[PDB]
Design a protein around this ligand. Structure first.
Ligand SMILES: Nc1ncnc2c1ncn2[C@@H]1O[C@H](COP(=O)(O)OP(=O)(O)OP(=O)(O)O)[C@@H](O)[C@H]1O
Ligand SMILES: [Ca+2]
Ligand SMILES: [Mg+2]
Length: 531
């Protein structure tokens, strides 16, 4: 009955906050067809196929432009700088809402109530509606699970309606990218999904909403993982996709706060999420034992290859290289509990995967370099590996998360700088990507570098200035091969490094040009690379 307030009709069965045991039974029902079907692996975790979409679809993301959002959002068609916040008319929104609500009508529906945000004063109460059990399972893992008493007076602040099985046949007449859609309306406080079954759309959708509400309130909202040592020292790790946020924050010596989305308020750093979402391509249980051991009943594997005997081929990227496992955060043994939060960060680490092979494995940044690299948000990929030999493709994504920013990048920079300054925090740039060898730096060497950051080894090392980027790098560090610390050493001659460094420096300079129309931003050019 209460679902008719959202536009949904004739629902006979509501499955309200299903238990983990019920979701297991629902996923393994032998009568399911198509992409609803799950299969049981020998690790005890259920595995599913997410269908045509095996990752996010930024080209299909729209935000209703109305008097609530017109003058506050960072719009794709207005400011400087590329972003995916494409404006949507209220009229087209009503068309999309009718598509989704008719798809959900007459169905058996799963409804999951959950929180986004660890702190009662700023968290969003979210109600997710789906007709697919494993999608309800994804949101149960990834958001904060309310207690019985919190469900009693639950009042949603936001509604997410997942109409994955429907599509929009009028898209060409409406100026949209395709028949699929991921749409947000901040007047109605709703998210609609059509066409894509990929669960990450709901996770990153709610993160975009927190990126809108919080910085406005003086609270930093950060695309980062976070953890805390036995002495109470908090570290945060920013980074773009596949740079290592989950991998490197999940350390058995430190208590995990969270692996992907955090805020930073007057009391400290807090997780938005209740679970973890780890990349599993080529997963190695010797290199990632805590993540591998989280894969058991109530974890949800996505798009991995499951053999006839139920065993898992983690090396197989034939459906996608974005294979994934989600698990509630308590599948990790050493976490902060019962609430995922801690004090003020004193170490801020920017992870980048540099496929140009130019950046050092680690550098301590000056204050202005911190703002510069935060706004630049650089990473690069090997694009055409499949095409035999391949070259590198750069991404500049402001704040290491431009796909999720709802406000202008300088608004996130300003609140983050405020929090860092008050805590006496220091920032570091860590290349988890490539060097002159054409191979990624190993997880073992990356973990030893992080350890040397967190224990103050790096702070106390002798350093020199890497040219062009003007990055302070150490001459040596406990636990790390000394050779790799200077990226020039990993080439035959240092002139090979020089040529790539010049190519890369020019990409940074061109990218930063859009921030230099204010005085503060023009002054930051001096912190950036210099030809
Ligand atoms: N030196 C390294 N450090 C960290 N990760 C590495 C390294 N070398 C390879 N990897 C691989 O990179 C991937 C990082 O996955 P992870 O889930 O940590 O990404 P993430 O930054 O959390 O991004 P996403 O938001 O896409 O999940 C894993 O497949 C990991 O094994
Ligand atoms: Ca990510
Ligand atoms: Mg991850």
């Amino acid at each position: 009955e209460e679902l008719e307030a959202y536009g949904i009709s004739d629902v006979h069965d509501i499955v309200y906050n299903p238990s983990y045991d019920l979701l297991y039974q629902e996923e393994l029902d032998p009568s399911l067809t198509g992409y609803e079907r799950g299969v049981l692996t020998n690790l005890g975790a259920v595995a599913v196929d997410t269908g045509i979409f095996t990752g996010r679809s930024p080209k299909d993301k729209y935000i209703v432009r109305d008097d609530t959002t017109r003058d506050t959002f960072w719009w794709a068609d207005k400011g400087k700088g590329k972003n995916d916040n494409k404006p949507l008319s209220p009229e087209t929104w009503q068309h999309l809402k009718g598509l989704v609500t008719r798809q959900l009508s007459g169905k058996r529906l799963f409804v999951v109530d959950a929180f986004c945000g660890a702190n009662p004063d700023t968290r969003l109460s979210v109600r997710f509606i789906t007709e697919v059990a494993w999608q309800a399972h994804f949101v149960k893992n990834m958001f904060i699970r309310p207690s019985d008493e919190e469900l009693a007076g639950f009042k949603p602040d936001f509604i997410v309606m997942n109409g994955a099985k429907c599509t929009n046949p009028q898209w060409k007449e409406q100026g949209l990218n395709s028949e699929n859609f991921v749409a947000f309306n901040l007047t109605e406080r709703m998210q609609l999904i059509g066409g894509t079954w990929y669960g990450g759309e709901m996770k990153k959708g709610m993160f975009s909403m927190m990126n809108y509400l919080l910085p406005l309130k003086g609270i930093a909202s950060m695309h980062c993982s976070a953890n805390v040592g036995e002495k109470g020292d908090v570290a945060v790790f920013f980074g773009l996709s596949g740079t290592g946020k989950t991998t490197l924050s999940t350390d058995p010596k430190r208590r995990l706060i969270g692996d992907n989305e955090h805020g930073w308020d007057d009391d400290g750093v807090f997780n938005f999420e209740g679970g973890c979402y780890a990349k599993t391509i080529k997963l190695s249980k010797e290199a990632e034992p805590e993540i591998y051991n989280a894969i058991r009943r109530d974890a949800l594997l996505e798009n991995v290859t499951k053999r006839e005997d139920g065993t898992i081929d983690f090396d197989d990227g034939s459906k996608t290289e974005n294979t994934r496992v989600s698990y509630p955060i308590y599948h990790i043994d050493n976490i902060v509990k019962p609430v995922s939060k801690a004090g003020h960060a004193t170490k801020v680490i920017f992870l980048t995967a540099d496929a140009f092979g130019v950046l050092p494995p680690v550098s301590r940044l000056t204050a202005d370099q911190t703002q510069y690299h935060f706004l630049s948000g650089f990473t690069a990929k090997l694009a055409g590996t499949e095409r035999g030999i391949t070259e590198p493709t750069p991404t500049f994504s402001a704040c290491f998360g431009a796909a999720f920013l709802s406000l202008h990048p300088t608004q996130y920079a300003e609140v983050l700088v405020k929090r860092m300054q008050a805590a006496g925090a220091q920032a570091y740039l860590v290349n988890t990507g490539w060097n002159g060898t054409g191979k990624r730096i190993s997880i073992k060497d990356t973990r030893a570098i992080i350890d040397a950051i967190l224990n103050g080894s790096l702070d106390n090392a002798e350093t020199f200035t890497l040219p062009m980027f003007n990055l302070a790098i150490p001459t040596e560090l406990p636990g790390v091969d000394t050779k790799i610390l200077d990226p020039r050493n990993t080439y035959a001659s240092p002139e090979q490094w020089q040529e790539k460094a010049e190519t890369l420096a020019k990409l940074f300079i061109d990218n930063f040009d859009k921030y230099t129309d204010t005085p503060a931003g023009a002054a930051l050019v001096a912190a950036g690379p210099k030809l």
